Every structure is written in structure tokens, then in C-alpha cells.
Amino acid sequence: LPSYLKPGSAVEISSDEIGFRGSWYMGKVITIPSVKCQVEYTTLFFDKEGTKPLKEVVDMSQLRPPAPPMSEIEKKKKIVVGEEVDAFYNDGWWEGDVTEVLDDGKFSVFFRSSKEQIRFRKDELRFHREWVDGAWK
């Protein structure tokens, strides 16, 4: 079993339910056994009242480790038109292109799955990484 799937460990969570395309939501593994585990989302809940954190059985292929801590130079390089990024939106990371860089530290970001175009502050974005074959790209 992969190191990062140990119960208790932080993860990010993909989905192929339509309307979660391009998202990675943060959570934790609850139960390892089939090719499937159960997680607990850190920011979603079963209920508006938010008393019961959401829990769900997924495939292990919908899971990936937390994104790597950006180095200090990486953590402060410039963001440019066309960079792929993840914006923090509906309490989740969503992937989009940067289409405009604005004079006040702000960016405008195009989402292809949802035809959406939304402004964000720099501290609401992260650099989009992919997690293939065990390594961060």
C-alpha cells in the first residue's frame, strides 16, 4: 500500500461526479480495507449546519497527497497570463487558466469545465501541479 494512504493522513480528493471536474478538496483517510478507501473531507459537511463532516468511500485513484510546500522562491515568483493555477473557491481547489493580470495584485482566471471567469487575489491561488506515477510534476 502507498505510503500516503495510511489512515489518518492528509490527502486531496478528486471526483468524477460532474460539477466537481477540475477540483481537489482537502481531506483525510479514515478506513483502508477492494481498491477503495473512505475519507473525511476537511471543508465539506453533510449538512448546512456543519455538525457532521462529510465522509465518503472513493477509489484510491481519486486521491493524491497534499500539494508540496512551495519553496520560498517558488512561493513568491510572479504569476503570468497562461499559467495554470488552482483557485480556492467553494472551499476547494479548482483548476483554471490565468487570462488577465491586473494592476492590483489580482488575477482573472478562466475555468473551462464551467465556462466561468472569476477574479482572485494572489493568496487565493496556487500553482497547479499534477501527481502522476508517484511524483509531483
Binding site: 460532474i18 460539477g19 466537481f20 465539506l44 459537511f45 467553494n90 472551499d91
Partner: peptide
């Protein structure tokens, strides 16, 4: 307060 319902983008 955020649920799958108030987070999804479609259907």
C-alpha cells in the same frame, strides 16, 4: 456550512 450541494458546479 459548505456541502456537496452548495459546492458542485453542475447537475
Amino acid at each position: 456550512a459548505r456541502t456537496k450541494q452548495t459546492a458542485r458546479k453542475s447537475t
